[PDB]
Amino acid sequence: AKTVTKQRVESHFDLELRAAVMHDILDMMPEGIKQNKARTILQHLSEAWRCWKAN
Amino acid sequence: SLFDHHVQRKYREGRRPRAVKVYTINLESQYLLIQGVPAVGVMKELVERFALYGAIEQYNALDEYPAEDFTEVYLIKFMNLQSARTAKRKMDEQSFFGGLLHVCYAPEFETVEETRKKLQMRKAYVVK
Amino acid sequence: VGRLGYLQALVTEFQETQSQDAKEQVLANLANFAYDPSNYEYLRQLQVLDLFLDSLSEENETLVEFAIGGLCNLCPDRANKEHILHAGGVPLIINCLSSPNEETVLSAITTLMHLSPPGRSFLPELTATPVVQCMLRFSLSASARLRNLAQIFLEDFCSPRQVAEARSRQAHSALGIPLPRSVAPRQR
Amino acid sequence: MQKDPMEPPRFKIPPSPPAPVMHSPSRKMTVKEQQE
Amino acid sequence: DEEELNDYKLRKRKTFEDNIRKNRTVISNWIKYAQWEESLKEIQRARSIYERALDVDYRNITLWLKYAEMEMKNRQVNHARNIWDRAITTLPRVNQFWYKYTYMEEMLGNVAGARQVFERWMEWQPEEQAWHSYINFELRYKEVDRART
Amino acid sequence: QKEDMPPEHVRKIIRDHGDMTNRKFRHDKRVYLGALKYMPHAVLKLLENMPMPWEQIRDVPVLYHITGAISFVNEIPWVIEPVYISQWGSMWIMMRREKRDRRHFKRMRFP
Amino acid sequence: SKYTDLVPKEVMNADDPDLQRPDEEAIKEITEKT
RNA sequence: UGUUGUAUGAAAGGAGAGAAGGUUAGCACUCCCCUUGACAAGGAUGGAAGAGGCCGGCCU
Numbered sequence: 238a239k240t241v242t243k244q245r246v247e248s249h250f251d252l253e254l255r256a257a258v259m260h261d262i263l264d265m266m267p268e269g270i271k272q273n274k275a276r277t278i279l280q281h282l283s284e285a286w287r288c289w290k291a292n
Numbered sequence: 293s294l295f296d297h298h299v300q301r302k303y304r305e306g307r308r309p310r311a312v313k314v315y316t317i318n319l320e321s322q323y324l325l326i327q328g329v330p331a332v333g334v335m336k337e338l339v340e341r342f343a344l345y346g347a348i349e350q351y352n353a354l355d356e357y358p359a360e361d362f363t364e365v366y367l368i369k370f371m372n373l374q375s376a377r378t379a380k381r382k383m384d385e386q387s388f389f390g391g392l393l394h395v396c397y398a399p400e401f402e403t404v405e406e407t408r409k410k411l412q413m414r415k416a417y418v419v420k
Numbered sequence: 421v422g423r424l425g426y427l428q429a430l431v432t433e434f435q436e437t438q439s440q441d442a443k444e445q446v447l448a449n450l451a452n453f454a455y456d457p458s459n460y461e462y463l464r465q466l467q468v469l470d471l472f473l474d475s476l477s478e479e480n481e482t483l484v485e486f487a488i489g490g491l492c493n494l495c496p497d498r499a500n501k502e503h504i505l506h507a508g509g510v511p512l513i514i515n516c517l518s519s520p521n522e523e524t525v526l527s528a529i530t531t532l533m534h535l536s537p538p539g540r541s542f543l544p545e546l547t548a549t550p551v552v553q554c555m556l557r558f559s560l561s562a563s564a565r566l567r568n569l570a571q572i573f574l575e576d577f578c579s580p581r582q583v584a585e586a587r588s589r590q591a592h593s594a595l596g597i598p599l600p601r602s603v604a605p606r607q608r
Numbered sequence: 609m610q611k612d613p614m615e616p617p618r619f620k621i622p623p624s625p626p627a628p629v630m631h632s633p634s635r636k637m638t639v640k641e642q643q644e
Numbered sequence: 645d646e647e648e649l650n651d652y653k654l655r656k657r658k659t660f661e662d663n664i665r666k667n668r669t670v671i672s673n674w675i676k677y678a679q680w681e682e683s684l685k686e687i688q689r690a691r692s693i694y695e696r697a698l699d700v701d702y703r704n705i706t707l708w709l710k711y712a713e714m715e716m717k718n719r720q721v722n723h724a725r726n727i728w729d730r731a732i733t734t735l736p737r738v739n740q741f742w743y744k745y746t747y748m749e750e751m752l753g754n755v756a757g758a759r760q761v762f763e764r765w766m767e768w769q770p771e772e773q774a775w776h777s778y779i780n781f782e783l784r785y786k787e788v789d790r791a792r793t
Numbered sequence: 794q795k796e797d798m799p800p801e802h803v804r805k806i807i808r809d810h811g812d813m814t815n816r817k818f819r820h821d822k823r824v825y826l827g828a829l830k831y832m833p834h835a836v837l838k839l840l841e842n843m844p845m846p847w848e849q850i851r852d853v854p855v856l857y858h859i860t861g862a863i864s865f866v867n868e869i870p871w872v873i874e875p876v877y878i879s880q881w882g883s884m885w886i887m888m889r890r891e892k893r894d895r896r897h898f899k900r901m902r903f904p
Numbered sequence: 905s906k907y908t909d910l911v912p913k914e915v916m917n918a919d920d921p922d923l924q925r926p927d928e929e930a931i932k933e934i935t936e937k938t
Numbered sequence: 939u940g941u942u943g944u945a946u947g948a949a950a951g952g953a954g955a956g957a958a959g960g961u962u963a964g965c966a967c968u969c970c971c972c973u974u975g976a977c978a979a980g981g982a983u984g985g986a987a988g989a990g991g992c993c994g995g996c997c998u
């Protein structure tokens with residue numbers, strides 16, 4: 238295993254926030270859902286953060 | 293006499309080089325003469341290693357034989373000559389306890405009836 | 421490339437060359453393929469038995485020794501055995517008991533032993549030949565292998581009645597007294 | 609066979625059978641809440 | 645000629661094994677490796693393929709289907725039955741496998757096995773349509789007596 | 794507990810294998826490379842047992858691999874401390890008097 | 905593998921001792937083994 | 939009594955080194971390696987893929 242060093246700090250944060258949001262998508266979506274649409278929910282997460290930075 | 297260690301050389305050359313030496317049925321024996329064992333008292337480990345291949349009727353170390361310094365020469369009697377051939381085929385030029393190992397056939401030692409059965413079995417195999 | 425094609429390539433390599441050492445390598449490879457049972461036929465289809473028989477006629481001692489070695493393992497099969505006999509190579513083998521090297525002589529003896537046929541097909545030839553006289557000296561030689569071969573040869577190609585006659589002939593030569601050709605051993 | 613200490617290493621360097629899924633029978637999604 | 649065709653086999657296999665090594669996930673892509681063997685009409689390949697694929701995910705729903713479909717296609721029936729058996733073994737809540745098993749037991753013609761399978765299902769009694777299905781089953785054949793139980 | 798062999802043995806082995814280029818020594822290449830791991834230990838023991846300036850020749854017990862791959866000096870240099878201190882005081886006196894008396898002291902070239 | 909082992913088991917205190925965990929000697933023996 | 943038991947680098951001959959205008963900076967996710975004493979750092983950001991459904995093809 239590689240450690241988290243100064244190069245890897247921000248990318249690791251995004252990597253972990255991404256995985257945790259994905260977990261909650263799976264537990265949130267109702268049983269026998271027709272589509273997952275996980276990638277689109279993560280696109281909305283990115284757009285929300287980008288709108289936060291731009292006020 | 294015949295125990296001299298011949299040397300190697302297109303002819304569609306193989307992976308390992310071979311010295312020029314034709315093997316006749318008489319040349320081959322079931323007595324296998326091993327020279328080049330380090331003189332570190334491995335009498336029994338060598339014999340076990342060879343007994344892996346076939347069954348060894350008799351093994352002894354012949355000290356009269358002119359050898360180089362700190363080096364040993366041994367005799368192995370096998371039970372079946374095909375076992376002797378495979379023992380040569382695989383053991384020859386194998387590093388053994390820090391020494392190059394040289395196995396040669398020893399036809400001088402075999403007696404008249406042993407030659408009789410050798411030749412007869414060669415005829416048996418060649419006919420079929 | 422192909423086994424039989426490879427053997428044919430060795431045949432070509434042998435024929436075109438003239439360097440005696442590059443022929444030494446060819447006769448080595450051929451004599452050691454002759455040990456193979458399956459490669460016999462492949463050799464039988466390429467006239468290489470007569471290649472060996474011609475090669476003994478060459479006067480390079482090492483080459484002749486190699487040819488004899490090739491023969492030795494090669495003769496014993498019934499097809500090949502009959503071809504060699506028909507060629508008339510037997511006196512070529514007979515010439516080899518006076519060959520200087522030990523190995524060549526041993527090979528010749530083995531080939532002679534192998535050419536032995538049941539039902540007394542070829543034994544008669546040996547008695548006529550002086551080879552038996554040569555054998556007596558060879559049997560009592562210093563070489564253990566030679567001694568074993570000579571004794572083995574006597575049982576295979578000789579008879580007790582024949583041996584006694586042979587011994588007498590050998591004894592007569594030492595004696596220096598001539599024996600009539602007409603006189604022969606009588607069955608009891 | 610005895611091994612001398614000097615030599616280095618010589619060679620270069622299905623799960624358990626699936627457990628049955630023991631589940632309550634799935635409830636199919638309604639079109640209303642599938643719109644939700 | 646033919647040698648070119650075995651070369652075609654081998655290079656398509658090599659790139660597919662790269663594709664497979666890359667993720668080991670992507671089940672939709674897993675089916676393609678199998679169907680390409682199905683085209684090549686050599687099944688032992690696909691049996692190992694689907695064995696590996698069941699190893700990655702048996703929870704899957706298309707995979708067990710597809711395997712049994714290839715079995716049906718190849719008209720080899722005993723293994724098809726046996727592995728529908730193992731399917732119903734490890735996914736006993738999925739209705740479809742049960743349907744596609746008893747349908748098969750019909751069109752292949754062996755009455756009792758379906759009976760036993762139905763009895764085994766009677767443990768779960770998971771859905772309303774399945775019972776109706778078995779009612780219709782029983783009225784299909786001469787028997788109305790079992791249908792009362 | 795074996796018996797020490799004559800020095801001709803190791804001398805002949807080291808002599809034969811020299812430069813490790815002969816095709817006959819193909820299987821000793823793996824063992825020589827494997828023995829690289831212990832060569833700092835051999836250097837440590839060698840320099841630890843260096844002869845003192847008052848002795849011409851020192852003979853040391855040597856533990857050598859049978860292929861000739863590595864040689865260890867198998868001893869520890871134990872000294873009596875007063876005797877040892879006196880011997881280097883003797884060297885202090887001799888070296889000083891020699892630097893005084895030698896007109897031109899030439900130092901040897903390195904390497 | 906069967907159906908009967910997913911239905912809710914009896915829900916009441918039939919047997920206080922049966923649910924109770926083993927005594928200290930057994931857990932010490934398994935602790936020493938492990 | 940042979941042969942596909944493989945790889946590195948070089949030479950010769952070709953291809954040409956991420957960014958929805960140009961010039962570029964990087965850090966990672968998976969699996970494929972190389973240098974390395976590596977829980978470090980480099981090897982073009984090391985290289986190579988990356989939406990859904992049905993049977994390479996078709997549809998949004």
Ligand SMILES: *O[C@H]1[C@@H](O)[C@H](n2cnc3c(=O)nc(N)[nH]c32)O[C@@H]1COP(=O)(O)OP(=O)(O)OP(=O)(O)OC
Nearest residue numbers: 297298299309310311312313315377380381452455939
């Ligand atoms: O043709 C090759 C080889 O195939 C053949 N040969 C080796 N071992 C043999 C055996 O057991 N029986 C027969 N009939 N032939 C055999 O001989 C030549 C050359 O042999 P090499 O591979 O060079 O081995 P070797 O003969 O032992 O070399 P040498 O210098 O004598 O001693 C190591």
Ligand SMILES: [K+]
Nearest residue numbers: 966967983984
């Ligand atoms: K990376």
Ligand SMILES: [K+]
Nearest residue numbers: 963964982983
């Ligand atoms: K870059």
Ligand SMILES: [Mg+2]
Nearest residue numbers: 979980983984
């Ligand atoms: Mg990097």
Ligand SMILES: [Mg+2]
Nearest residue numbers: 962963982983
């Ligand atoms: Mg750059």
